[PDB]
Write a protein that binds this ligand. Structure first.
Ligand code: HEM
Ligand SMILES: *[C@@H]1O[C@H](CO)[C@@H](O)[C@H](O)[C@H]1NC(C)=O
Ligand SMILES: [C-]#N
Ligand SMILES: [Ca+2]
Ligand SMILES: [Ca+2]
Ligand SMILES: [Ca+2]
Ligand SMILES: [Ca+2]
Ligand SMILES: [Zn+2]
Ligand SMILES: [Zn+2]
Lengths: 219, 142, 222, 213, 219
């Protein structure tokens, strides 16, 4: 064995290296350039606003064409550039059943709670083939309250819709007169994983709490 | 410096700027406390009754606020010597019996004199504050 | 210690050796960089296109080549209509059926050498697609509305503008334009996109009737 | 034979080494500290354009679960953010000996109206019991050469750094209300904007762009 | 490896040596032959005196020509040998702003202080291009006094000038009636780094303290 042994050592080295790189993958996944830019595009676009009316959908990013939000993701090309039927626009995964969005609820009205976890749990979706403009969502709203020294879950069943055009999930409490506030989430972070939410009164849309959920998801 | 009529007026105005707007008031208080306990951690034992072990506890918040209220009466009456003497006597009574070394009062002073310019951030006079604090503290000690 | 300084002595001049190697590598790489470069893909595309054009095809009138490895000719009317008529399907290729040369806002410009009709010296001509329509039941043509305009001096201030309508044919790779409805049969345009991309074309400004060539310009997309 | 085969082995091994280091370089490019910084700076500009997420005297912990925390509680060694953000900012951009050179943007209040200002950090005193607001002793150095004269100046001044606001506050040393405030990008730390402000009117009357020298 | 190994050992030896020499540099910097001789020249020249009047500047060292000190470093060659505009003469570094001269003040009049540190801190200089004979200096005078068991800083703002001809820095207290004494420093040690100073009364030039500052400089 001349320097064949040396080459063997080199090979052990390469094995070690490969192991290390594979380890680096976990840390590499924590960086999403494309997603970062999509987020910034979202936030900047929010600061810009639009020239469209309420209940209207602006076609491109720079584009000047407006469309009724009743025509967004309905299966028909309504924009001169077809943006209203684009895949990013029409992505149905913000309300894919099984999704569990969790976040901290910060109250500043209505209720006198300290900061606490809230989960929006997507339980089901209906999308009529004759009206694809909206997805009808059913979900469970859970809240971990450390009310009286000990912990207690406060949950309720709710129903509403996800509207593609403004990327908004509205959930009002199913037959829950019992002073459970509605929730309104905007998937305005460039993805289908995070949303800026509020606990609101259904009738007036008055915001009683600030809530920011991320998907995390798995109990 | 010494606690003039004038420098008392200055301290009074600056204290208005720092304390009178109940927003970050409990946070101001708690900052003072974190600094104090950082200097003299042995002093936490004096505050067992009021949860000195956890300055974020509601009981200790209530405490630090009571403190700042007393100190507020003291500052507010720097130009009303009769009232000042009264409040100082009251605080003194509330503090007698408790074995509090000058050490701890120096800790309190240093804490206040570091949190104050962080609060105001601008126009403040550490010498005037030093003088008037010394007056108030001497009043509380005896 | 001493053994420590021996070990450190070995380490020190292995790094030195690595540094020398690095310097030598940089020399060699620098020497390699001075061997010219590779070629612009556009220059190659256009060269290949020019060769292809000089080679021609055995197609009949109203036929166009499918392209590819085994030559086959099919009808004008069979390109990009959703059914594969070429043995290799090239008549439905996504590149062949690029509708970009007829896109709204597309404008092709270049300097014209005239041979008749206009007695002006070489100036630019620009033809701009202003509208289009591709009927879903007859896809082998894109019907277009265009405008032919001429570059004229700062002193002229009475520019001439010709409104045209016509089509883009995929197999021909041809933009054919004639006078708009009721607009005085003065000019027509024939552009052939034969440089291998959607961005250059050989144009002639012709008489709408006789197809007589009035002038030629090498069009470029701007 | 016993050399040709060995050489082929060494060759394949070199090529493997190359492919492996290539993967490593992709990994490195993705996590390149400078790139992450630039990203942070961009994000910061956007944040500047948005409405503040926190009350006037608080600090946004950031993250996918936002939270506001008193400015006086940032970098005091006690975790107040649920994500501990208040306790990881804590690297002071100024070290004893650092020089920053600022070039004028606009200026209509300073005495010498200089082209550039050098800010020299001379010392830093950090109270162990109050580490969130380090105190610096710095010198403001100016050198202005007019027709009538040549003037050189080195003004000793006291300063505070706020980790909460990523901000240097240099208190005036001369007899004008003129203080220097350096706002850091949040992510750069080799460049700040130095605004000169009247301690009283709060009027902003000069601006210099400072870079680490 | 014949004696190649031996030569390697020699090389380690040389490395060690080089390290040691580089270490000796620090100690070597503590010796300034040229500066020593310049100092002695200064001191001897002081013992000698000159034949020039007050407010006059003697040209060379041995040279007999005198010049008005209003003509020294004014940009015009006034000495037959141009000494009044020489670089050593016209060096402006004794009062380069940023300089912090420190020394021990020994009091023997006016004040009853024990020996204590004093700093002259150069804060600024103005040199008119129409009158270069003098540099107008502004400086801060600080004193560490261990007055009453504890330490206390006594500082004041001051203003004056550096005159090239007699190498003298005069600093009188800016609007400081508050019994702060003036300071007069002579850079008479051959360099721009050390000065022989006095605390004096401005009106009478009476010397109340002896003070010798050196540059040291960096707080
Ligand atoms: C001038 C600064 C100070 C002021 C204005 C002040 C004022 C007060 C006030 C208002 C109370 C509330 C008593 C009550 O309402 O029953 C109090 C209690 C107390 N003080 Fe102070 N104080 C000062 C400094 C200190 C010092 C330095 C210490 C030593 C660490 C100290 C130790 C205590 C303790 C142990 C209590 C009672 C705690 C309890 O309720 O269990 N104080 N003081
Ligand atoms: C300041 O500006 C002047 C020119 O106006 C230049 O000569 C000098 O080097 C600059 N100093 C620094 C440190 O930028
Ligand atoms: C103070 N208690
Ligand atoms: Ca639609
Ligand atoms: Ca076909
Ligand atoms: Ca903290
Ligand atoms: Ca002269
Ligand atoms: Zn932060
Ligand atoms: Zn200084």
């Amino acid at each position: 064995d001349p320097r064949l042994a040396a080459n063997g050592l080199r090979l052990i080295g390469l094995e070690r290296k490969l192991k290390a790189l594979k380890a680096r993958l976990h840390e590499a996944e924590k960086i999403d350039p494309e997603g970062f830019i999509k987020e910034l595009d979202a936030r900047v676009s929010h600061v810009e606003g639009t020239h469209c009316a309420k209940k209207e959908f602006q076609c491109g990013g720079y584009d000047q064409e407006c469309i009724s939000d009743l025509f967004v993701c309905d299966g028909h090309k309504d924009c001169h550039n077809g943006h209203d039927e684009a895949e990013d626009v029409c992505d149905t995964s913000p309300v894919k059943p099984g999704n569990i969005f969790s976040g901290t609820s910060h109250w500043h009205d209505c209720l006198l709670r300290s900061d606490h976890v809230t989960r929006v749990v997507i339980k089901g979706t209906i999308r009529r083939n004759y009206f694809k403009s909206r997805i009808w969502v059913r979900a469970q709203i859970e809240s971990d309250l450390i009310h009286d020294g000990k912990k207690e879950l406060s949950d309720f069943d709710s129903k509403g819709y996800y509207n593609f055009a403004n990327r908004r999930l509205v959930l009002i409490p199913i037959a829950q007169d019992d002073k459970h506030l509605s929730v309104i989430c905007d998937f305005d972070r460039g993805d289908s994983r995070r949303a800026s939410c509020h606990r609101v009164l259904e009738g007036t849309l008055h915001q009683c709490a600030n809530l920011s959920v991320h998907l995390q998801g798995h109990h | 410096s010494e606690c003039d009529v004038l420098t008392r007026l200055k301290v009074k105005a600056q204290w208005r700027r720092a304390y009178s707007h109940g927003h970050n008031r409990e946070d101001f208080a708690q900052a003072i406390w974190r600094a104090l306990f950082a200097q003299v951690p042995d002093s936490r034992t004096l505050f067992k009754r009021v949860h000195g072990h956890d300055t974020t506890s509601p009981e200790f918040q209530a405490h630090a606020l009571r403190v700042l209220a007393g100190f507020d009466i003291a500052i507010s009456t720097l130009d009303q010597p009769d009232a000042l003497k009264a409040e100082l006597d009251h605080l003194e009574k509330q503090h007698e019996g408790r074995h509090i070394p000058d050490n701890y009062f120096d800790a309190f002073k240093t804490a206040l004199l570091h949190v104050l310019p962080a609060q105001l951030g601008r126009c403040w006079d550490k010498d005037a504050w030093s003088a008037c604090f010394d007056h108030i503290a001497h009043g509380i000690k005896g | 210690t001493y053994k420590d300084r021996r070990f450190q002595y070995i380490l020190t001049n292995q790094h030195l050796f690595i540094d020398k190697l690095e310097r030598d590598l940089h020399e060699i790489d620098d020497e390699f960089k001075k061997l010219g470069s590779d070629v612009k893909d556009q220059t190659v595309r256009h060269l290949k296109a020019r060769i292809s054009n000089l080679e021609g095809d055995d197609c009949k009138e109203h036929e166009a080549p499918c392209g590819g490895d085994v030559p086959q000719c099919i009808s004008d009317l069979f390109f990009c209509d959703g059914h594969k008529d070429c043995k290799n399907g090239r008549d439905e290729d996504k590149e062949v059926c690029s509708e970009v040369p007829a896109d709204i806002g597309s404008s092709f410009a270049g300097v014209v050498s005239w041979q008749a009709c206009e007695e002006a010296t070489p100036h630019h001509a620009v033809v701009t697609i202003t509208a289009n329509e591709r009927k879903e039941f007859f896809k082998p043509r894109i019907w277009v509305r265009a405008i032919l305009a001429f570059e004229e001096e700062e002193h002229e201030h009475h520019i001439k503008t010709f409104q045209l309508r016509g089509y883009y044919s995929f197999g021909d790779r041809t933009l054919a334009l004639g006078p708009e409805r009721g607009t005085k049969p003065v000019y027509g345009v024939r552009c052939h996109f034969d440089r291998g991309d959607d961005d250059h074309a050989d144009c002639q400004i012709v008489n709408p009737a006789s197809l007589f060539v009035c002038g030629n310009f090498a069009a470029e997309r701007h | 034979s016993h050399d040709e085969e060995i050489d082929k082995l060494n060759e394949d091994a070199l090529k493997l080494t190359h492919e492996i280091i290539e993967l490593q370089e992709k990994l490195d490019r993705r996590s390149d500290a400078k790139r992450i910084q630039r990203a942070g700076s961009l994000k910061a500009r956007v944040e500047a354009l948005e409405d503040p997420s926190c009350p006037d005297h608080e600090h946004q912990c950031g993250g996918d679960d936002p939270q506001c925390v008193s400015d006086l509680l940032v970098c005091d060694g006690i975790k107040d953010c649920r994500n501990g953000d208040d306790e990881s900012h804590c690297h002071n951009p100024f070290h004893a000996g650092d020089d920053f050179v600022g070039d004028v943007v606009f200026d209509h209040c300073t005495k010498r109206r200089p082209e550039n200002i050098t800010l020299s950090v001379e010392s830093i005193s950090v109270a162990a019991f109050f580490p969130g607001f380090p105190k610096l002793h710095v010198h403001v150095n100016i050198h202005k050469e007019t027709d009538e004269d040549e003037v050189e100046v080195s003004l000793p001044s006291d300063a505070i750094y706020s980790f909460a606001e990523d901000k240097l506050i240099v208190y005036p040393s001369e007899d004008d209300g003129l203080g220097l405030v350096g706002q850091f990008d949040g992510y750069n730390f080799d460049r700040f904007v130095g605004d000169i402000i009247h301690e009283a009117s709060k009027e902003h009357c000069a601006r210099f762009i400072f870079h680490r020298k």
